[PDB]
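Input:
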Amino acid sequence: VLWHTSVPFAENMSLECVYPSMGILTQVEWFKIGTQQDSIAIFSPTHGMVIRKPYAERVYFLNSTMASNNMTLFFRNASEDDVGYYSCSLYTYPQGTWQKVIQVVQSDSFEAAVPSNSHIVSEPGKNVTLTCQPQMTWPVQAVRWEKIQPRQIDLLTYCNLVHGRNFTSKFPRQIVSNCSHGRWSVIVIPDVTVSDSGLYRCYLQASAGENETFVMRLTVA
Amino acid sequence: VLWHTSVPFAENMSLECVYGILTQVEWFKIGTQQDSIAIFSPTHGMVIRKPYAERVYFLNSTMASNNMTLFFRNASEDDVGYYSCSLYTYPQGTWQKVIQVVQSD
Amino acid sequence: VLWHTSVPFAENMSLECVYPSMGILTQVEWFKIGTQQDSIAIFSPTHGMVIRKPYAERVYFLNSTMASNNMTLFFRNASEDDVGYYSCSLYTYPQGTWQKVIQVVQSDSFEAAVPSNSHIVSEPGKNVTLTCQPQMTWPVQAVRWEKIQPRQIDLLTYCNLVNFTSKFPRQIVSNCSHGRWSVIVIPDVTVSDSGLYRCYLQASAGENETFVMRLTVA
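Output:
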């Protein structure tokens, strides 16, 4: 998993999956994630797209140009059973397999759930350093950084400090994240553009006193 | 296999279960057989099985905090025994916490 | 995730990944699954094989008939660190992904410690039914049917009773629909089917049962 987003449920929701040119694309496959993966569609760069029968009347794709790299999944009339986790799996040569995970949640604008704890104004071209606000004697089990927009959360990184594997987002842009050594608290956004404006959230999952967070608004001139 | 957490019996006892991408959570009672208590999925939500419907509840707080603690609002002598808090993550798989409920307090 | 095949150590060990013919083969990739997914080699049916630098000296593959459905990972040389778990992933169109997990065991431990609890004799051409010996004292979490050979142990059937499909090319008839997990049928048995078979029962919160049976075909 190199890319993890969350989007609100809608009857006409589209699950964005645009792959960066990286080597040769050899196959794409869409899955509904559960304990067992449910295949939605499979794409050949030679023979085209096959939608699995349970989804034949429920999803479609755009007739976008080849160099658009667009595998975005579109729902006709989505229903409550289409809530959950999705996988857009990219198979490339010689780099290998990578996966984008998209979670469909029941939700309003993701900005509405978060009031900013902080505001920073920067200019394009500068690196922007963001920090968590570690507090307690309570051990931090997990740390996660997200970029928040009204229609989309981009999971930038998470560090499991007690158990599990870590995650660092590649795509769409570079996130400087390390996790090791009590510097899970800091990330850098190198060379910001206006499109980097938005809300940035650090969530701290602790042991007994779990669940604390810090939001900061970035505004690029 | 033995237990991870051991608690004494109480009518209002709560069985703590704390803890990526969670695809399924299920509570079982382990005796001579395995009885399902409640099952959760991100698509269907939390669905409690009928034999425990009047016994247990969940305070569905932040699920991203990884908390599925089983609350007894009423508990009887037969709620003593072994419990399993079973967890499936994507694509890693299993994570299981076994909990013992002791009658002697 | 558990394994499909298990083999003992050897510096010339061959981790068999014979796959079925199913649609168009579009890509193959070998990983070593440790605490992290580590890439060994990647194959394109047009561009050929790339072996990642950490395994360039270690491993090699046949350049012969690959159309025989063969991507077996041959070791040229091997150390303690080549012990562990491997993933042989086949990518096909339109069927999708086909994955075989392969276990390499260290201590010089293998079928030498496997005595039978039961012995069945059958003539070739017969449909042989094998059965577990469930004791009905722990709920059965999961069922594994395995074939124990001198050079490899293969998974025949897996059933989680809360998914994992066999990659063994024998066509074992099994269902695990409603208690069916306790039996498997070997149809039209041959002399090559002789050997040790094991039913493995995983308990939810207890100890695991083992029933080993020897089948000898006339």
